[PDB]
Design a protein around this ligand. Structure first.
Ligand SMILES: [Cl-]
Ligand SMILES: [Cl-]
Length: 150
């Protein structure tokens, strides 16, 4: 799989604070911003809800979590997102076998603490609850790859 630069960016972004005084581990949107910044990928800005709005507008929408995992394996930046009535959530999809043959692996920060956080060993199906899991949107930046040629 070709996601090593993405994973590296996730690892680096974990300890950064995109927003003053707010660790990215505790801020899903700031985490994703820092990942994109390291990768040089234009990323819609703002809170999780504003990010999903932006991604809907300007990124390529994928059909499934299966496809999300495939695109991440090809070295493309893939964001999983779902708007909330109050606050949304966003995560970076990484390569790896699908959880329950449906849900791709991810990294994400969360204000919720450990229950909403992933350092790559949780799938989106173990961060979002049983109902939200099957309603997630997956967006890919199809314009340029986030991998260096083999
Ligand atoms: Cl938010
Ligand atoms: Cl693509």
């Amino acid at each position: 799989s070709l996601d090593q630069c993405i994973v590296n960016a996730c690892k680096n972004s974990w300890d950064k604070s995109y927003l003053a005084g707010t660790p990215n581990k505790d801020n899903c949107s700031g985490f994703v911003q820092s990942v994109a910044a390291e990768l040089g990928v234009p990323m819609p800005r703002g809170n999780a809800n504003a990010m999903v709005d932006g991604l809907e507008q300007s990124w390529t929408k994928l059909a499934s979590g299966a496809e999300a995992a495939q695109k991440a394996a090809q070295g493309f930046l893939v964001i999983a997102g779902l708007k909330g009535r109050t606050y949304g959530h966003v995560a970076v999809v990484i390569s790896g076998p699908l959880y329950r043959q449906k849900y791709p692996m991810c990294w994400c920060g969360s204000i919720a603490g450990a229950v909403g956080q992933s350092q790559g060993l949780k799938s989106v199906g173990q961060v979002w609850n049983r109902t939200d899991r099957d309603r997630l949107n997956y967006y890919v930046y199809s314009l340029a790859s986030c991998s260096l040629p083999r």
